[model samples]
Target chain A: MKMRTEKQIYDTILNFAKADDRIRVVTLEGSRTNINIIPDDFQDYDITFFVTDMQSFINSDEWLNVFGERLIMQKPEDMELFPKEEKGYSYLMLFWDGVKIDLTLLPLEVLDEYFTWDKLVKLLLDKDNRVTNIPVPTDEDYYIEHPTARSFDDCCNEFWNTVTYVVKGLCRKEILFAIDHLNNIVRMELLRMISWKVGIEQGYSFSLGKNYKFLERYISPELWKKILATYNMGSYTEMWKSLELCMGIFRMVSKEVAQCLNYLYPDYDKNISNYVIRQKEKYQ
Target chain B: MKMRTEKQIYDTILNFAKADDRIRVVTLEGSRTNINIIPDDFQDYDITFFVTDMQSFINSDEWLNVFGERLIMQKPEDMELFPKEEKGYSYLMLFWDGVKIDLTLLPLEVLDEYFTWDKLVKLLLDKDNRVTNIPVPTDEDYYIEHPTARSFDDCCNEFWNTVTYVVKGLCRKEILFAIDHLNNIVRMELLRMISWKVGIEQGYSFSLGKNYKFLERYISPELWKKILATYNMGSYTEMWKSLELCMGIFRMVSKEVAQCLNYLYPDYDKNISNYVIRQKEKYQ
Candidate 1:
């Protein structure tokens, strides 16, 4: 029934962990730890409580009542239906007063594994000197870096090769299949190339945020506009044209990237582009 | 883990329902029920069981063992954090053998509501005669119908009006916002126009298979190619050119539809197009 502020929630969680001897360590993750993301009221309290006895906590829902009356809660690792990949147990809790927390409890033994899982995590309390020296959380690990010549060549080859699948999918009238290849595979290559370009422009020192959220900041007006058009796949013709434009922009960027890195832009781009033309004509 | 065929899964499910008097009615939905969808190995068994007892099934996991070892499963309605809107509880199961079954359980009281829910549903069982005299399943509900004069004009107005937001978003370097409006609002109008053209050709009697999946079958090569160009939003230049092509195609389609329906295509198209030019020029 109480409306708890962010500080109250954080303090309560910390105090609970402190009072309980089984709770050895506490850490924070998600958008709260990502310095690039601006904090808001809706931002979840992503806390992980590393404990000695996982079963004792799992055995009782009574302990969680200290938090609040949960509108609903999901114990992901406990569910028989969907088996989670991670060994740690998670409680996705939503309180009636409008605070959501993704709390995970793992054996203190997997503390090392937990830290290894997410680059953006802040160790809040390390009783008994477990996590003694955690570095100040920085999203530096997520920054777009200059691609090596091999990765560059791989991007070029992958983009051109995947475009062929899109062509085949379109010709087959399997537009969903075409979209999957284009958006996931080919467009990913395009995003990689764009990220590389961003990295180069910004001296490879800044984070582009997740999924290239900050991509527009570094790209030119002409290229940015072209990038927006790549999303039009309303029809088969649209898919083909999107593929063609991707090839054109990719050619320009890849050539410049190749020149900048002293790598050869694969002849496969030309080969694949011509092949796509033949296929489209064949379908027509 | 043992592998099971489609028939085995169906038999096991149907037998389970038949044996238990609790499950009074059974219905099938999704791709399996759609006559237009080609049967494939990947198609899921989207089955719903209308039962007298809901809580008994929700509390126990023992009965589900007959289906085979689950690779993963999701119970959307049962999940606390992200509770689904539907009152029916669903189990999205992925068997070890790669077969997926989306099984839902609803109280028999909701049988009337269930029948009203989806047009594609085919009643497999009706112990209570709740869903007797069901019509033959057809995807006709998804067919493209002739647009009214008012709707045709609205589509044109919405398409041209939304283009300004895209231009503004692009000019401000908010490519995602530009894309959001362009793809969701502007391009949708284009698809609406394309559907009208498809309907005009095909007598409005066939399904385009959601989002006009069968559009290519009805559209001409030249127009389709132009349609493809509209997806070239990889950069600003591409976005501009793509927008131009969309405007051109929309103009031609709207004019044709107006003539067919004897509707007045609003002069606002010219005004909006000119405004877009001025905005582009201003940005330049």
Candidate 2:
């Protein structure tokens, strides 16, 4: 297969969306919208088409022929499989080539009111001046909100609580399980904390992609290297060690975050983490 | 959904095969027979039915409904979607609820010859007494094969060689790519080496289940713990760290194997790992 560049795919999609009359306006979002993400490299064009009629698109799967052959497809809101209400005016479409386009359609009448919605707003394309007096597309749409005390407590609570599962996986010698829960759940929470901090510094308007890979350029050299060490998990034993390292990484980042936000790191969290390490020792 | 015991699923499947005259014999394979794997878990009942007519079964999708609604299905050897091959065994069926049943039918006349062709044989029920001398189903068919001198060199050559791609992933700061090659390709080479050692120790008569989960009971506790450490990876930086841990684990295991089997562990391999680690440091 010919390896298609981001520009080629972007142009193909842009041309396709522009030709369809039902598709009234297109909005760009995600990492692609953030100027801070890549200085030179082209970001993925995450275009959302605001269509005139939803049924015409839903009843027929014909419009999908635009993305080339799919490796896989997910229709989040419209499909019977996933819950519809939680989707919130979005139709999530994921293509096989590791590109995701979250398209949301709006009724031409309600399109005017959508502009007034409270969340960070940016208007990319407003055909026929449907979305008027809107801010230009920027990282403003995905700013990190200042964490409330409850949110801070919750983040700490979740991060510390989930590490127990990782320890259990290590103690039980289920390394893959241990590592996944550590990486996917516990460590993921830590990264989220870091991202929140980054967003705080950057005016909370920039998003660090889904898993924060985009944050490599944002973190300190030494800290980034330490963060890199957390992912070397291979065997069951390594998974546990990785968990410990993840804890270390989290500890460093959370301390900095606590100082910046002038919030106390939960003492119970530290106790729980200590208890986990102790439990591993006891089991071993 | 009512959670079915693994036996209930197996018995239900066997009964379905028993009532059908076309399906003469039923056999079981996969994790069900892996001795090292603990039994508290629900072992996937990979049932196979050898029948008189293959075409009759292939003509309709209705035959599988007797089992249950499939989560998804694939006809592996038929049509353009899959590479065309008769497979002698025509269809492979995967059930929802994560059970996979691969069914192959042979002419009644050829049944005796087909049954004797492989040691991974087990006869649950045979109406025609097709195997008067039936061998018990054992996972010997899935046993890890001892690498030949050439295969050993090939595996070693391949392992050290693939480390370059992982270094590239680190240089590019592509964590997913770094983690994948580090976990899948480089670490996999070490797993292959370990499996070869275990297979040789077990007289090449036992199988390690897919992903080596069964390796838990067999590997030394210290080694197993180290294995868990390998999964310390969380992000791109963590992936690189995880790769380092992988190198450490590989050294530990490969040295143990070399001591046991009189194979030389190369110094150049360690040198390559050190160089990659240094290069990744530059990126930080």
Candidate 3:
């Protein structure tokens, strides 16, 4: 069982679009269209089809069968809990041979509505010659933006305050709750602060990539590894390790961000760190 | 530090409001107004003040110092990452005495917009006869809703499909990503399915509380204990344990819900479960 190549996949997609009158415009997005080098061998294709009739494609999965035999897939628009209001349905799939594709079907009428053409969108087959979009495919659109002092203050304030939830969750021994705040909000802020620093150095002209998934590219090997280390939460002990490392990272990056941005560093970071340590000690 | 009693807290909140001319109305929300019994002693006060002036409160934390000495606090409207659109500022405070209060200040003009007399809101100090509300405070608004056949199918589709991401993350050694989807989306769907089953039994009459926090009450103690066990994810080993347990619970509840509601159980469940196990075996 051989896996398909990008040329074959693209050819198949274009051929399928030609045969199907509904798929008026086929465009590509995500990392594929971006200038960033593939960080890993695994790059999921973000494909969009501006179909004249959207529901017909969605009515059955057989249309997608032409892509490849899927190992597994998630259709967010098809789900009950998460639904779409926009004119599209998303098919997120992992194929048998390690290929992953995220396909969305939107009505041709909404072609203007869809990105209206973003830098990260490359026209694959514009049946109507409608997509006059090109791909400088700049990652700049998703760059780590320059921060105002007000916004920086808010981020710092949010980072420290959210730590309170993590500590409360930890002290109460609600590891799940603690981990939620730590990863979702607290470490999220760490990423934000780190990116702000990255943005500062780069003149806010670049992105570390989505979720800072391409974080390793911009940061020093040691710091990037440490940032990865902060993702731990497998045990209470690991939670503490991650927390301490996270606090340490935030202090360095946030303080640096504050100074570089000429913003007043938040006063409560020390108090909150002490509070988290005190609570952890009391809990232990 | 002596912790303040409920009466003392309530009295102080009212007294401060009376002294402050800007505060036109004070209201209480959350479990205090709901009929549901408090599952834990640590019920944080969910208080709202309809003030004539909003910025004065936002300008400084000194106005809030009237409540008590704070151990730590989070001001959401003051933060950058998270923003407020509707009407007010949120001050989440935990005092030294172990009292947690989530206080929000809205402009008196937008008092009509602020829940406008929800079942779970008690008008504490309606300086203006504005808050004509009740404590039927019927958690009815937050009840677990009955599922339609389409919605059930969607939920089932969503559940099994999301598992693919979990398996993908696990295989990739991104424990953080795996845990995020597992806890955030995957187990989140499990709770959704379980709650749907609960709703079926109760005629969609009740809520198990926020985030299904009081989930322990409805199910058997053993089942509840098992549910608690699913919160574990300290290691790859723990992730497997939680995923398996989550799958088991979802299957049982989903099957029962499908049967009772006359909805066909999604066959993809078997396929996804097998996919997860096969991938796990290969990864191991």
Candidate 4:
């Protein structure tokens, strides 16, 4: 099957929203809305449709058929949500065509304020001038910001502390345990810090898709590759190698963060160099 | 605390061997004897001593003190391959003092033939007749055998099928489920195949150290980092990026394998390519 390009998806969603009178102020957000990012053939379409009547959109699934097939559909209000009434029906829809649209229906009145805070949103076409109160779409709101000293230190602690579990798990041959702590707990913390550091460097305007692979575009290619190497924790020996690579990545990011924020970066290299010795002496 | 070097540990074992006449030959295996691998500060000494008296060595605990402290020990044969007759004792001793000794006992007369096999093994110090009838250690025994078409197809099938589960788990907010499938099942299988392909090229004499980071050294840094990117299954989007990386790496290795084996690499790149695409399409 011939797949649609990013432009085609963009145009299709744009034209669909334009033709629908009810979708007065349609905007795009998520990764698609980031201009610096080159749209790939496989990119998802994250479109939000603002409507005149929330109940009409909620009561019917008529508009969703325009996307071809539904992979899955969720109406946030339909499920149990805290302070549910405060937010209108927000959809987390996955299409069979391989597009993800997070369509949140906001009453036309608050449409302007919604875009104000979320500036990375792209204005497709605002029918009733409701979105005029919002500023022009800019990724300024998502630009990288320098991490605070406390935040930087916290990231280091999380990365290093999380590593011990990986070591133990590998030693025990509990690979699943080792991987869980690394990806879910440890790597998440590292990615969060890396993204923040990237955000700080890139002016805090980018959405790095969550797990920080897209940070490769902004960070040094070498550093990015090194960050990627941290995941090869398969054997006991490789676990050590992966941990070392992780340490290297952390060191690189922490140094960059220190320079960006004018904050003190801890002497992790010297410390980690001696840490293996200490572990050998005390535990090994 | 100053740690003992591999040489120092070797000397310690040699001193014990010299003192005990029963230990006629000392053989070294695993990473310690692998000269191609640099002696890292963290590497363990895996030494196997060939002895004439198995019962005498088994009866005494003094042999362990030569290495270092006592953290824990593993005697695999004690659990699984406990020989009842005069086959002699094969003790796998892991010293807390930072060394692992997998010592095997054989009659001093059989030393010559024991050291040489189609597989490579190194003799650290052969005091008696252990080296008399041995051939030079060449890793000819490990030549990559041509894989059966069934094995090739199975590995591909396993990787792609498991990848779908990972995508499903992540997009559905089942982070733990996603990680189990991606990092443990899917990534491991993909890594095994990739490493096998690399092993075939390098003559299969070298080991990829269990979890395949050893492949990192042979893999292009660009490809290595891309392979590493596949482990970032922390979030829904990150899971998708990682799944793509799996596809990218698999495609690379598959093509290389096809050329080497004269087998048609299943040209289903698009099928695997859309694994993540189709999943994300559900949410969009």
Candidate 5:
């Protein structure tokens, strides 16, 4: 199947909205809307249609048939099991023609609420001018903001406190629990600290893209190496080694952050590190 | 605020379900329902009430007020932006009393469909006897399974081919791109190969859990150590070192699986490693 050109895809979708008066407003999101992101063939069309009526569009699956022969589609709202939300209906369609569109239909009334948090949203068409003064879409909302003293303390607290659980899980030979704690909690804190360091270096103006996806851009070459080492896990010895690496990064970054913010680096950091060391030595 | 006892929390939820005639069935999921899981205070009460009428309960916030003062609540369905699904409404509540409940209200129609994929579901109540003969939860759906020769080939292909992208990204001084490729794509293939090795040794009957969360339980301490080393992506030198470690593990594991299954190991594995080395040397 031939791939549709970007213009063709856009025009097709926009024309559909224009034809249907129910679709009062349309907007684009994700990489497509982010001016910082270089356009590519692979970028998905994350389009949302704010409509006067949803049930009519939802009931007629044939309306979406204009998109192309779909390889598959996921109707999140229509699903019976583990349905997400009633506020909108989404059609996640992947076409046989090598195009993917994540189309969400929301009530026209909720149009204002939709743009509040998402900085990547670009208003395409608003018939009633309901979406007035959508400022130039900048990914500012997602930028890695400098953490406050309390927020920094909380991140440190979460890290240090959770590392103890990981160490405990390791000592008990509950590798799954240990890994889970490390992966979900400890690693998250580490990621936060790493992002903060990145934010400091790069002036906290750009997002590393959800969960620090773009973290490597701002972190030093040597620091990135150390950061990667923290992912090593499996045996007690490796988990210990990983924990040590994590503590080292967390200490260095958190201390720098604390100094920057004039906050006291938690005593729990030292306590936890020492505890982990004593436990590792005892077990080993 | 005081924490509620498990009995108190369970009785509170179950009693509420019983008193409401609209609530027909209740099922429990997640770590709470897994027999293999060791019970702990930290586990949340992941309860789902299959109700005949969902809208009535959804409209009334007072129903959930009985659970005690909530520190926070997330109604995923009620949100205008990224509304989850309409089929079920979920109340993710963290009470001031230190009790967390991920209470989902599903329509009575979807009750049968919900249990089809989740092996870790335990039916707590069935007022109308809609749910019958729910086989005891075993977590069997998540178990590791034997990979076919093609599946094995695909994993190797993905790993070796993607290594070229990492190396190219590194050569271009696109460290973030390289790391992202290495972390998301290369590591995933390595994980697949590692899991396959574990499956071979442990009879492919047990899961390493989602994303190989329980991998340490099945692989050797020494091999696990090697696996852990592959995560170090600090300097270009270190990334090269990590890549070499990964290639070694992938080579050994893939070759073993190939020999066991009488499938030929790909020559591209050798080619890619040599290619990566050459590129690194050229760039450095």
Candidate 6:
């Protein structure tokens, strides 16, 4: 079998829509539609079919075999443990020929609702003229913005509160709970505050990518290494060290952000830092 | 190993305390001291040592090997993912001789604070005499009390609000989010309200076991079956059915409790129930 070309896969996408009369509107979304996406990076077909018969398409996914045999597939809604208040049914398929299509299904009734949130969508076919004025899609919406004063305070407040929860676990000797609160809640706020600091420094016009996977390039090498050190929490001694390191980093970044925005730096950070140190003394 | 008798185990417990000068006070908690616990059931020694050198006991668990453990051990503080704003460190050990000990350690400084909340403690030994007036332990604290009117209203409001979150997930087609809210939040509220109903029916004075593991005796077998059905969220069809069943059960139980306490049955329940049914129709 030959590696399928973009033209062939896209034709197959159109052919899939053309054969199903219930599929009133079809869309091309994701990197394939984004104008800012470099051509060298490559793309997949992120397609959506707005159908009158949403349940019928979902009830029997057998019709999806028309796309081509898939190496692997994932239906987010069909599985537990991942995702959110997502708007459509999706089939994330990687085909045998290395062609991938993230197919989404929605009711034709949701066409107006779909356009409201989804900015980077290219209208491919609309039988009823439901979609109009197809603009060149851009990732302008995905850009990282500077934190609002309230959002910064909210983050600081959450960071400080969850920091106390970690200490509560530490004092209780529940290392798992301490690490859980540290990694999931506290570290996330750390990343967020650090990201905001980066945004402040580098003009908040670009993203560090989702999950901040691109955070390293935006951070100082020393800062990045310190951030990496906070994850080494295997023993209580290490956890305390990690906790102190996290507090120091959070205090520096959050204070700077507060100063930049003329926001009131929360007193909780000062007292909490002292409290963490005091607890460390008692335990050690 | 020979099965250890209660007398021999208690002697070892005393000898361990005598050997450690740092162990200033010792007490027995749990079924051994509980007046309500039947003699036929048998009991484990739920021991706590108020120690001056708290870190020495924890830093190396080598000293705990004197307890003659064989089968398994769990240090609650040593683990992750299970527990909360807990106050002390626990070593849950089960010996090959069918003897179990849930030994706890606390700083001697916290002895005063410990006695404040711990009503069911039998003071076994207090070298420094920081403890006093040992009372017969009771499960009275664990009894399910009748919900106050405000508590009922709060429960109803929470139940209704979270129901909307589940519907939000359903509308968004994120079944995991829906089930997560249903299972963790909504179903918990369902059990809580149901437990309150049982409390009201049976005079609000007995234990249903922690996690309400003993809830079956309090509910009719048919009601138990219906409660079991709500956990079957394997498919969207089943999820909708589960949602409807849960809403129905919650409404019925919550309404009764509200009436009994003269609390207002939230309009949110009615509106939300209709909304749930509405979404089911759209999807099915």
Q: For this target, which candidate reaches the highest DockQ against the unseen true structure? A: 3
What local lDDT does model 1 show for residue B197?
Answer: 79
Worst 10 residues of 6 chain A by lDDT: A35-44
Q: What TM value does model 2 have?
A: 0.46
Between candidates 3 and 5, name the one with more favorable DockQ.
3
Candidate 6 on B1-284: residue-level lDDT in tens? 24766788999999999888989888898767767555431256889988888778789878888889544455656543234356678887656454668898888888767776766788888886665665666678878867776567666655765676576556654454565577567777788888888988887677765456567677897887687666556445666778788888988888888888788776667655665566556656
Error of 5 at A261 (Å): 19
The segments of candidate 2 whose C-alpha lies over 4 angstroms from its true place after superposition are A1-284, B1-15, B33-41, B68-118, B141-152, B196-206, B281-284
List the candidate 1 regions with Cα displacement exceeding 4 Å.
Answer: A1-172, A176-284, B1-4, B60-62, B78-83
lDDT of each: 0.75, 0.63, 0.75, 0.61, 0.74, 0.72
lDDT of 3 by residue, A1-284 (tens): 33787788788878988998777888888878776654443568888888777667777878788887876677876666566754478888877676778888877777666664467877788766885654456666787778888888778777887888777666655565676788678888888888888887766666665445556667897896687666546566777788888988899998898887688987768778777776677667
Candidate 3 chain B worst ten-residue window by lDDT: B34-43
Q: Cα-based RMSD of the predictions, in order? A: 17.2, 17.3, 4.2, 18.3, 11.1, 19.9
Look at candidate 5 and tell me the lDDT of residue A98.
Answer: 40
Q: Rank the candidates by lDDT, best first.
A: 1, 3, 5, 6, 2, 4
Candidate 6 chain B — worst ten consecutive residues by lDDT sum?
B76-85
Ranking by DockQ: 3, 2, 5, 1, 4, 6
Native contacts matched by each model = 0.16, 0.26, 0.33, 0.02, 0.10, 0.00
Candidate 1: lDDT of B113? 69
DockQ for every model, please.
Answer: 0.07, 0.10, 0.33, 0.02, 0.08, 0.02
Error of 1 at B86 (Å): 3.6
Q: Give the Å shift of residue A30 in candidate 1.
A: 28
User: Could you say which candidate leads in TM-score?
Assistant: 3
- lDDT, model 2: 0.63
